[PDB]
Amino acid sequence: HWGYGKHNGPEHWHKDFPIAKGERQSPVDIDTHTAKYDPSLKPLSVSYDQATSLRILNNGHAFNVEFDDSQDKAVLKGGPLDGTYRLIQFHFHWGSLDGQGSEHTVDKKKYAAELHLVHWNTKYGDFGKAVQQPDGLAVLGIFLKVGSAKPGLQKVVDVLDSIKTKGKSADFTNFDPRGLLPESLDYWTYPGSLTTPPLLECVTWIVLKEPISVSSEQVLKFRKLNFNGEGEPEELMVDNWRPAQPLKNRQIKASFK
Ligand SMILES: [Zn+2]
């Protein structure tokens, strides 16, 4: 029964998931002056032209846009990664107010939201096996700020009324995740974890420097979702973000000077 409330939020997770106090937890603050440029890091290769989106699901903590990951259709490679990582789903974390919502921070700055494109390492065969490995996942994190609308987000925003409550799903085919990417693929990278229970330490994080802009109307639609099921007391799905965790024995690397 973990969540984001006063009685079950991030400060309680360690009781059920002791790895919450582990050595490589996420998110973290990205101190830009202390990140080190690593000239040997390769450009990212984001290959989403053949992506097959299938469905959108309200899982009670976020909404996931799910993809067919039974072939190499939408893959992430390069950068810090060895091998090929398949896109399984993306989701967001967002705030009740524009001044909070992101999980990672940049020099302590919080963005309005954060997009996570979740990929798993094909050498492990399936997602459930991948999360048990220290190099199992690669998550592309993209910050959202409020300003101009993001046209490529609109199809997502418009279906949210159909998945208001926990356990609702809707068909969501032919969505192109390339419309959620900023111009630049400059990034920071570090080893970390899932940011929701089970908090497994299986993620190579790749956090883009350049945020995307979304409109106030778009983020407001996020905030109309519900954490609860239909016919349960309504609680708005907002502030579904875990705060920054200690960096411990990790160095954040930058792909750019
Ligand atoms: Zn996430």
Curated annotation (Swiss-Prot):
UniProt-reported outcome of changing H91 to C/D/E/N/Q: Strongly reduced CO(2) hydrase and p-nitrophenyl acetate esterase activities, impaired stability of zinc binding
Main enzyme class: lyase
Binding-site residues for substrate, renumbered to this chain: T195, T196
Annotated site (Fine-tunes the proton-transfer properties of H-64): Y4, N59, N64
MF term (GO), any: carbonate dehydratase activity
Residues binding Zn(2+), per UniProt: H91, H93, H116
Site (Involved in the binding of some activators, including histamine and L-histidine): Q89
Phenotype when changing A62S: 2-fold decrease in enzyme efficiency, as determined by kcat/KM ratio, and efficiently inhibited by chlorzolamide
Consequence the record notes for mutating H116E: Strongly reduced activity
Protein name: Carbonic anhydrase 2
EC numbers, comma separated: 4.2.1.1, 4.2.1.69
Other information: Target of drugs used in treatments against glaucoma disorder and breast cancer.
CDD domains cross-referenced by the UniProt entry: alpha_CA_I_II_III_XIII
Medical condition linked: Osteopetrosis, autosomal recessive 3: A rare genetic disease characterized by abnormally dense bone, due to defective resorption of immature bone. Osteopetrosis occurs in two forms: a severe autosomal recessive form occurring in utero, infancy, or childhood, and a benign autosomal dominant form occurring in adolescence or adulthood. Recessive osteopetrosis commonly manifests in early infancy with macrocephaly, feeding difficulties, evolving blindness and deafness, bone marrow failure, severe anemia, and hepatosplenomegaly.
Post-translational modification Phosphoserine, affected residues: S162, S169
